[PDB]
Nucleic acid binder design. Structure first.
Lengths: 51, 329, 30, 129, 106, 25, 229, 213
RNA sequence: UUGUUGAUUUUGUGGGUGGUGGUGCAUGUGAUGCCCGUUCUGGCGCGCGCUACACUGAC
């Protein structure tokens, strides 16, 4: 599960996505584009998600 | 002795014969240990006859026999625990034979077989097998365990290990089998043996005590004859037949290359090629599990539904309150 | 029946009719 | 390794798909290399574990039971390794003698005339007194 | 390639006091499941054991588990305060008598 | 060395079918 | 090529509930169910056990058979589709009481006990599990329509309607949608109980069908259609 | 036409309801039930678990009421646990209520046959095989047996032959009641199947395979 | 061994038996078909108000 939190606001989950059943080791926001988020998993597929 | 102490003659004769069943078993073992090369025929007339008597006794005194059988099993580790093969004798080979006669070897768990099979497997691996007498002793053990699994056909890894080293021991290394651990490099057969004469493949027990080339060759033939039977019956059915037989194929190939005339490995090899050809070696699939149904729950209810004394005491008061309160008005 | 009794035991029927799986509880722990 | 789902047969599966599996079935070859010393290059991950399947048929009952776990769902998180490390042939026999369950010793209905072969029915052919 | 963390991996389940305790649950409330241990008792045991109250049960180390054990079994030596650790039938018969004699009056 | 790791791992260690009816009482 | 799921242990599928409207499912509405309680203890009124009493009630004892409702639930509840968690059952009593049946329930196979359950549900408005963990039989507020999924197809069993293959029928339907089948546990009567809610009526066989037989036949096609086995 | 055991040529789906727990006891003789007569069965030593006849009533209702029966392509057989083999005339409409069903079986067991003024229910002599068609395929319902599509099974079988489905009315027991007579055992669903449900599936499959509709 | 009594039993080992068992059938009979006890001791209806079913919440 990949979770997005508003910085300095731990209480509230802004967005939760289950990328894969396998562990998700890398989760990086795209530097150019805000909307899209990239995730890598032990599933070996690096899905590109969006908010 | 059995006739003089039948169960009906007097009370307690059942116990005396039951103890006699254990006593007879040790006598059968005891005679085998004794030298009998002088009078093998007379020994054969006694040795089988006593076994037949023991079979009748075992049919009624299996409990007493089994207890003695365990005790002999237990004792011989202790002798193996100090003497190793020097503890092992002809009678021990005889013993494992008698157990198969008088007990069901084709059981997943049995009182006497399972201690015995584990014990024989220990010899098939722990023992050095560094002398012709020792190898010949191992050859008998392999045959006994093979008969034990004559129907069950369970897989014994020690049998695989024993065949590999013995085959390689008689070819001593050729520098291409470094994964097999040998215990004697001086037992290599000479190149001059004919391997076409008809040599008896039966190993007499009495010859074990006495123990040259012909004796080495006969032991080799008996061992590999059991090897061919093992491939045909047990290893063929196993899913890993190709992996199990692969080291054996190379060893048999060395026998043929060094000896064109020597025919048995070619027959075993050619047999082995046929088994591998027909068998389809496929990726195994075992985690294909039956789906699980949704959970089940029974309902709780009353068979006769209805629409502690202190509560009743309070209840009756209220009814009494209402009447009495009316009464005053 | 003797033939049938033998077949069931090759499959793991244990006579005291328990099974082989019952025999493998606690064995490895101690 | 324990199972390749591509080789499973489904009942509803269409006959053209049924034919395809045989072509996949027939052309398979085990790619695991035993002589390669590099664990990252043995191509083990593409092979399958047949050797453990044979261990399910091991003569010892309990040892086979351990091999049967791989045919059972992997509910358990892990197995305590220290309970299985120091085991010996002596321990197996000692544990066998010290068995919580006791069974009845039974007998073979089959009858063998001679226990060893000569130099009717022979229990141990190829061995003589 | 070879990395081993000395703390050890997160433990999904643990066995404390002959009881299975989920690593996921908070240490204080994961410790309540044991019989006789409530929220306050678990809190105080954690405070005595010097275990941070922002930790999950799975993350606990062996020494912390042993310490909380020793706190539980042997409370007093760690100076835990002691405080912290037919007639109705007769009345019914009397009422019934009263009611019967009340009917007698009426 | 075994005895040391025996201690540590101690903490680590932890349907009606067909026509069957509900129980009588 | 695709990576296997992390956990291969078989897990029970989710138990379907009225709150969840997205998932496709098999809805079966046993309309015109004849269930009533009356003090003698309350006993589920029966055509054979109680005819003098219902005569005093003035209702026809011909339509006083809770048996037909009982057998239909056994077949529907025991079907593999139920075991797969793709079927949820509703029961509409002739008197206007709507009952939701949890897929996990195990109603007593014996009819006499089944009467004991129904008097409890009608009076207590709910039925508890032995372990007290879930709502198995609950009475719910009418109309039935709100309890149905948002996108769903509605049909009734009509002998006079055209005979259609249930498998081909389900196959041609969509994948987001679901199916409702309004089956009459009523013995005899005009097939207009669910006319208000249903959009079309279909026939399952040329010959007359019992409610237990028809519901079983319909669900088997769904298992073939959805590949439930 | 109404099929009869005398006629063997006609293709038909036979269903054998083996291990049927139908027994009559007189304190007057009445059909035994698991719950109605508990202490009475205890006096016999027969466990009340296997005293469950309405399963046979349930299987008969779904079998008899199936469209295939209306098409005259199905006959039902009941082999009682006691060893009594019963013919079911396809024309019979057994009572829907169990209490009335019990009154039929007691009459059938004692009188040996039920006649209406052809015997609707009649007792017959064992073994089953003589009553079965001369050319016929035999199978049982086994959970361990492989999952097979009944529609797929019937399609590949020959036409002139006939199919027997041995369904065990017993709530629980080892599935060997018909092993002596049957040649292969087949599983129908991955999940457990009740006797009534399982026989209904075969009726549904045979209808689709033979296009009974 | 009985309850005084005299071999009628007792003990140990093997061991056959369904039988003062029912129900029908054929002029009672049938190597008939089918299956498979004794005596006592007890035995509410109609109405109100308040609290919960949590994250708009608990601490």
């Amino acid at each position: 599960l990949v979770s997005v939190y508003d910085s300095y606001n731990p209480r509230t989950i802004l967005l939760s996505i289950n990328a894969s059943t396998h562990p998700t080791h890398v989760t990086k926001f795209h530097t150019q584009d805000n909307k899209i988020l990239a995730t890598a998993s032990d599933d070996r597929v690096t899905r590109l998600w969006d908010i | 002795i059995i006739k003089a102490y039948q169960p009906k003659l007097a009370e307690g004769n059942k116990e005396k014969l039951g103890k006699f069943t254990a006593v007879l078993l040790r006598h059968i073992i005891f005679l085998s240990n004794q030298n009998y090369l002088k009078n093998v025929q007379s020994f054969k007339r006694t040795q089988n006859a006593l076994i037949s008597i023991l079979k009748s006794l075992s049919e009624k005194y299996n409990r007493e026999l089994s207890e003695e059988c365990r005790d002999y099993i237990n004792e011989m580790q202790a002798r193996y625990k100090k003497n190793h093969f020097d503890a092992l004798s002809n009678g021990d080979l005889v013993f494992f034979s008698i157990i198969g006669i008088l007990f069901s070897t084709s059981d997943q768990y049995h009182l006497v077989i399972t201690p015995a099979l584990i014990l024989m497997s220990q010899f098939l691996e722990q023992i050095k097998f560094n002398s012709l007498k020792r190898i010949a002793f191992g050859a008998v053990l392999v045959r006994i365990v093979s008969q034990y699994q004559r129907i069950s056909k369970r897989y014994i890894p020690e049998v695989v290990y024993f065949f590999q080293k013995i085959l390689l021991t008689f070819i001593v290394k050729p520098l291409d089998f470094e994964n097999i651990r040998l215990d004697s490099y001086e037992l290599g057969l000479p190149l001059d043996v004919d391997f076409t004469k008809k040599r008896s493949t039966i190993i007499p027990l009495h010859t074990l005590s006495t123990m040259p080339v012909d004796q080495c060759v006969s032991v080799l033939l008996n061992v590999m004859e059991s090897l061919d039977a093992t491939i045909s019956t047990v290893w063929k059915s196993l899913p890993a037949f190709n992996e199990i037989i692969l080291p054996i194929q190379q060893l048999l190939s060395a026998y043929t290359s060094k000896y064109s005339d020597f025919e048995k490995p070619r027959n075993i090899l050619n047999k082995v090629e046929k088994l591998t050809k027909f068998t389809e070696h496929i990726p195994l699939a075992l985690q294909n599990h039956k789906p699980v149904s949704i959970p089940t729950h029974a309902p709780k209810y009353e068979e006769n539904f209805n629409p502690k004394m202190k509560a009743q005491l309070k209840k009756e008061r209220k009814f009494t309150m209402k009447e009495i309160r009316k009464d005053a008005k | 029946e003797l033939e049938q009794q033998r077949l069931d035991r090759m499959n793991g029927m244990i006579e005291l009719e328990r099974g082989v799986e019952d025999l493998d509880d606690g064995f490895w722990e101690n | 390794m324990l199972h390749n789902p591509a080789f499973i047969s489904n009942p509803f599966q269409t006959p053209d798909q049924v034919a395809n599996l045989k072509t996949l079935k027939e052309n398979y070859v085990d790619p695991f290399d035993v002589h390669e010393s590099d664990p990252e290059l043995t191509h083990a991950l593409d092979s399958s574990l047949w050797e453990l399947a044979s261990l399910m048929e091991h003569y010892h009952p309990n040892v086979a039971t351990l091999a049967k776990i791989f045919a059972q769902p992997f509910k358990k998180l892990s197995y305590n390794m220290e309970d299985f490390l120091d085991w010996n042939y002596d321990s197996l026999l000692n544990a066998e003698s010290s068995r919580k369950l006791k069974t009845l010793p039974t007998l073979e209905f089959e009858a063998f005339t001679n226990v060893f072969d000569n130099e009717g029915n022979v229990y141990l052919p190829g061995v003589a007194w | 390639s070879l990395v081993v963390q000395e703390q050890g991996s997160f433990q999904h389940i643990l066995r404390l006091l002959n009881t299975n305790v989920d690593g996921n649950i908070k240490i204080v409330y994961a410790l309540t499941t044991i019989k006789g241990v409530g929220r306050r008792y678990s809190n105080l045991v954690c405070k005595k054991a010097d275990v941070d109250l922002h930790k999950r049960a799975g993350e606990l180390t062996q020494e912390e588990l042993e310490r909380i054990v020793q706190i539980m079994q042997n409370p007093t030596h760690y100076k835990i305060p002691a405080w912290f650790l037919t007639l109705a039938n007769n009345v019914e018969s009397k009422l019934r008598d009263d009611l019967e004699r009340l009917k007698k009056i009426r | 060395d075994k005895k040391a790791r025996r201690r540590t791992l101690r903490f680590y260690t932890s349907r009606f079918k067909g026509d069957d009816d509900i129980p009588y009482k | 090529q695709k990576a296997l799921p992390a956990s291969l242990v078989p897990q029970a599928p989710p138990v379907l509930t009225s709150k969840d409207k997205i998932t496709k499912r098999m809805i079966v509405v046993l309309a015109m169910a004849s269930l009533e309680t009356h003090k003698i203890k309350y006993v589920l009124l029966n055509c054979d056990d109680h005819q003098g009493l219902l005569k005093k009630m003035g209702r026809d004892i011909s339509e006083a058979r809770p048996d037909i409702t009982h057998q239909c639930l056994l077949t529907l509840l025991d079907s593999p589709i139920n075991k797969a968690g793709k079927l949820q059952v509703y029961i509409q009593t002739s008197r206007g009481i709507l009952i939701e049946v949890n897929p996990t329930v195990r109603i007593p196979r014996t009819f006499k006990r089944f009467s004991g359950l129904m008097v409890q549900l009608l009076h207590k408005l709910s039925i508890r599990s032995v372990n007290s963990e879930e709502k198995l039989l609950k009475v719910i507020k009418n109309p039935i329509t709100d309890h149905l999924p948002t996108k769903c197809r509605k049909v009734t069993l009509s002998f006079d309607a055209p005979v259609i293959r249930v498998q081909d029928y389900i196959e041609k339907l969509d994948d987001d949608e679901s199916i409702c089948v309004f089956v009459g546990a009523m013995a005899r009567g005009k097939d207009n109980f669910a006319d208000e809610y249903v959009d079309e009526k279909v026939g399952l066989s040329n010959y007359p069908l019992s409610a237990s037989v028809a519901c079983s036949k319909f669900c088997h096609g769904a298992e073939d259609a959805w590949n439930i086995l």
